Design a protein around this ligand. Structure first.
Ligand SMILES: [Mg+2]
Ligand SMILES: [Mg+2]
Lengths: 371, 371
């Protein structure tokens, strides 16, 4: 039982060690928001808005999402008494789409409760693991030779799973190379909606490489063509973009669009929603794993608590800050210990903000009286 | 061949005669934007942003959409030379969702071209009609008696089609009443996503009332449950919310989710997109008609040109301004002549702005240089 006294929206931007390539862009940093929800008893809950700057991933964007947060989500909490962190998905239920905005606010509310109950956010959602095996993603390489070198570094580093980025001209030849060299390494392929039905031959040729899964070969809204392809392959197909809720998984399932789901907290609307989906995939043999969105310290802390659940077996897209950022905004840095990350045990998300580090990356601060 | 010199974003709000009820709200007016695109040869193209204030219809909202227009759509036109109005859907293609933002800008570009070619926008997209039969929508009534009275007024007024709003407790008993009283009046039912699979009995009981169609009984993102229902009915099922493109219709089709499509320019991203869909429904026996979004003068003018196409047979949701607004922002008011509206013949959308009437409803004006 708690009431949210005020909200503090912090806009920050972290320098990426290396540029991140998106569909129709290239990130040079992680532009995000920190939603700080403050209890009426002095507890601070933290969430992170993950929306990319361009609507080249999903329809949402940072500027538009934070706008929906201010004009749509925060006003709802203003009055309200919240009893379960899960009541949040409900009052936001009438809102269509805008999942990443909801997530930023809702995940803050969860952290606030786990804090109140002196538990890890991981402990609270029921997780038991104390560490989780994270994976690694490699983009497109011009050389097969150089891909194999990159693949070698990580394996030696402890990463027990590798996601290879695929594309019509650079697909089958690279998968072999890696498969016929790491015959026991779990390996998946991400096709970033680069194929058409006409390329089913190319896609069928990958079935025989024991690929863990092939992510979104066709349209970002497609169910039909995916199903038409899934029925012709042994490898699981994985959806991403069009998976926003359990309801969305249910459709993909009955249609037979996929056998695996790339679950990302932000894209799915929060924690309540993510768990419902995890539980459902578990009951229907659908492989579920935590994808990523270049999260800063706060985003990553939540992601790891979700990843700690038993349903998640496949290594997710989480990693030590040091892989992307020169610096992060969370005090207990995430140490990579041979393909594994330590699940926070401290109250809430388990990590604190370097109000120091933050200050030098903060572009604006806004406080909102939810009362 | 034209280049857009500048853009003028006019924010206006018209007083509604009577309150308009939305899913989780009630409009008291039409808050919208007018996108005025100005040629390099002095031609003015006009579009209208239709997004509702709350994300209770689709994910978009006026405030967030106009934000996407400024930050995402207008910058693309800045440099560009446009040869066909249809080039607009293309450069916006990489953008996910955000259809109502696209529409406001793209429809402006069409009007600008039809103007350049001294043709009606209706003439240009190929329409031939000179008038179109519009319908009328009635919300939920407490009395069956009073619904029948309302139904009587319109029929005598000339409306050749009536859309009845349906809901679990107020459905079958009203349909009869109207059907067993106007045995020859085309009649459809709009279920505004108020039913579950468990209510298929209720929905099957309507099949026998020669209902033209039943709009979105189930989820606003659902294809599956709709298909499961369509296969059990004679009446056509009509989708709305989840129909954003030809591609979306293609899925609904192969899945068998519907037999009719409620086509609204804004929700579908513009004219290029709307025509593609109309043509497709025509080739695949799918009933297509123009739905509405409480358009002001500009929105309505475009809608009527689309409605003039041959594919649209069923009366759309268009009407004389006088049905909703005390005043409108378009000089040649739309006269209702026994269920029909006269298709503009004047250049472009065929109507002019009462810069006078506008001024007293304008809340802000913003000019943006595209050179
Ligand atoms: Mg993806
Ligand atoms: Mg509807």
């Amino acid at each position: 039982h708690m009431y949210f006294q005020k909200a503090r929206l912090i806009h920050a931007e972290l320098p990426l060690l290396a540029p991140f390539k998106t569909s129709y862009g290239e990130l040079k940093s992680k532009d995000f928001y920190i939603i700080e929800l403050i209890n009426e008893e002095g507890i601070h809950g933290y969430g992170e808005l993950e929306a990319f700057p361009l609507p080249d991933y999903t329809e949402e964007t940072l500027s538009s999402a934070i706008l929906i947060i201010k004009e749509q989500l925060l006003p709802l909490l203003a009055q309200r008494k919240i009893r379960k962190p899960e009541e949040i998905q409900e009052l936001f239920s009438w809102i269509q789409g805008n999942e990443m905005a909801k997530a930023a606010v809702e995940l803050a509310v969860w952290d606030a409760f786990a804090k109140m109950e002196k538990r890890s956010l991981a402990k609270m959602i029921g997780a038991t693991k104390e560490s989780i095996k994270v994976g690694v993603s490699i983009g497109l390489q011009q050389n097969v030779e150089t891909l194999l070198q990159l693949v070698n570094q990580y394996v030696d580093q402890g990463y027990e799973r590798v996601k290879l980025k695929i594309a019509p001209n650079k697909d089958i030849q690279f998968v072999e190379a890696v498969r016929k060299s790491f015959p026991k390494l779990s390996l998946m392929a991400d096709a970033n909606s680069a194929y058409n039905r006409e390329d089913f031959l190319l896609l069928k040729e990958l079935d025989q490489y024991d690929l863990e899964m092939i992510e979104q070969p066709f349209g970002t809204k497609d169910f039909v063509d995916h199903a038409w392809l899934q029925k012709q392959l042994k490898t699981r197909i994985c959806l991403d973009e069009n998976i926003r809720s359990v309801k969305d998984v249910e459709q993909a399932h009955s249609i037979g669009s996929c056998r695996a789901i790339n679950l990302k907290l932000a894209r799915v609307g929060g924690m309540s929603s993510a768990l419902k989906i995890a539980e459902y995939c578990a009951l229907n043999e659908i492989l579920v794993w935590c994808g990523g969105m270049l999260e800063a310290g706060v985003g990553r802390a939540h992601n790891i608590a979700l990843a700690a659940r038993n349903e998640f077996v496949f290594p997710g897209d989480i990693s030590a800050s040091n892989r992307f950022f020169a610096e992060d905004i969370v005090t207990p840095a995430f140490e990579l210990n041979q393909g594994r990350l330590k699940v926070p045990t401290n109250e809430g998300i388990g990590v604190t903000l370097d109000l120091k580090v933050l200050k030098k990356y903060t572009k604006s601060t806004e406080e909102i009286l939810l009362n």
